[PDB]
Design a protein around this ligand. Structure first.
Ligand SMILES: Nc1ncnc2c1ncn2[C@@H]1O[C@H](CSCC[C@H](N)C(=O)O)[C@@H](O)[C@H]1O
Ligand SMILES: Nc1ncnc2c1ncn2[C@@H]1O[C@H](CSCC[C@H](N)C(=O)O)[C@@H](O)[C@H]1O
Lengths: 250, 254
């Protein structure tokens, strides 16, 4: 992997080009969601923390954050971003999760990497086991309108001098997913033309509302509220990023 | 040679333009001009090619048996073009507009080289230099990209491809009040297969669009009163939606 600057500039690109929600607004929404529903939240468990952009917001707002991610490299960058002011663990979902938290969050569409509705339901079960009755789990997912409709088979690319990258999307009409080929070139030194090339490839899956509710209900979240990209707006046909608020059974 | 791979990169960029942008393959370009010469009864033997680049059109003309004189402002391109055709052509380094070699039966200039003329006067001067070395009734065929391409399709879009050993980015910028398109090109080439070490190279230039009335007026003032314009080396005439225009100019009498 590379520096937090690279991943931060990819997030910058997603915000400007595709409408991804900035992390300060994300945390504003989850805090308002907790307040409006009267939840007492002091300890927060964050799934798939990455470089810790949401972890920085949660820590800055005074919460006792526990953050997990399957990459030791991501956990290293996140610990540096927040100065170690959170307990980090290395876990890959679905798997047993830490306990003792009042609320759980999972931002930046990590759930779109889940292969099947089964793997989705398994992750929700992993969260439900470590959630007290009546407590909340907030995550986001990208919709088919974004994966198939907007990204589709188009290409995005940017040359920022020290960093250049290519997003290559492929989408079949008869599927619920799309494949992303990511290519990245980072400059060695400012006074040279040497670059390191790195590539990643992932399949991004879409889950319709009927599936999300069935898996949440089966996992112990009979109550599920969905909103349009960290606002009070309801999700509609043109919604690209859905924010789900799940409430543990009692 | 540091050329078979250098021409390879250029060739792949042409492959991309053909597959993604509708640029015409060179064999079809040569089919078009040969049909133009035959319809006019021109027994063409000596062909003058302007802005030959890496020589893709040069190779088509050499293979079809013509005596080719090819010009370009870059000695790098001329070296690549000379290698591609095995030296079976006469290569001249000329920065157009400037005096041209005399004696050709026909003149061609393919793949939107005239979109690099930064003004209509300079375009007209290049046409005037062609007219100086053509007899009455001889033909000049060139193609240009249109405003529908430069200001409409490309305009303000990005195109990129990762082909493994080669990756490139085309960044076009276009303002409505100008007649041109800014081009930022970025390129990465791998040193040897197996390692992730790449060489990064960039390049910036402008592409200019000319409406029909300007081209016809400049061609007429340069001694080409009669001009036919077609859609990208087909028999269909140019329309508002045409992206690549093929102009067929006839040198005036006397
Ligand atoms: N099943 C899984 N379990 C744990 N981490 C996962 C995972 N799938 C993806 N990840 C990790 O989640 C991260 C992508 S999301 C990171 C951005 C962060 N959520 C934010 O708000 O900015 C990556 O580090 C990836 O390795
Ligand atoms: N004013 C000018 N005088 C001479 N060569 C020029 C020129 N403007 C551009 N060129 C040349 O035109 C070429 C780009 S266009 C060449 C494409 C080629 N005919 C083909 O069929 O594929 C470059 O080699 C460039 O050096």
């Amino acid at each position: 992997a590379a520096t937090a600057d690279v991943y931060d500039r990819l997030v910058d690109y997603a915000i400007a080009e595709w409408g991804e929600c900035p992390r300060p607004q994300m945390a504003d929404f989850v805090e308002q969601a907790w307040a409006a529903r009267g939840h007492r939240v002091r300890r927060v468990l964050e799934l798939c923390c990455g470089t810790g952009l949401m972890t920085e917001q949660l820590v800055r707002r005074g919460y006792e954050v526990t953050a997990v991610d399957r990459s030791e490299t991501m956990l290293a960058l996140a610990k540096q971003r927040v100065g170690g002011a959170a307990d980090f663990h290395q876990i890959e979902l679905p798997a047993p999760l830490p306990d003792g938290a009042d609320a759980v969050v999972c931002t930046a569409a990590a759930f779109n990497y889940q292969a099947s509705a089964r793997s989705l339901g398994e992750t929700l079960r992993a969260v439900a086991t470590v959630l007290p009755a009546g407590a909340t789990f907030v995550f986001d997912i990208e919709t088919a309108a974004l994966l198939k409709g907007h990204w589709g088979n188009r290409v995005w690319a940017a040359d920022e001098g020290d960093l250049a990258f290519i997003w290559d999307f492929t989408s079949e009409p008869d599927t619920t997913y799309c494949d992303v080929h990511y290519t990245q070139f980072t400059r060695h030194e400012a006074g040279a033309d040497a670059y390191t090339g790195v590539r990643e490839v992932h399949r991004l899956y879409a889950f319709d509302h009927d599936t999300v509710r069935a898996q949440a209900r089966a996992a112990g979240f009979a109550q599920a509220e969905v909103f349009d990209n960290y606002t009070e707006r309801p999700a509609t046909d043109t919604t690209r990023y859905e924010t789900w608020v799940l409430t543990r059974d009692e």
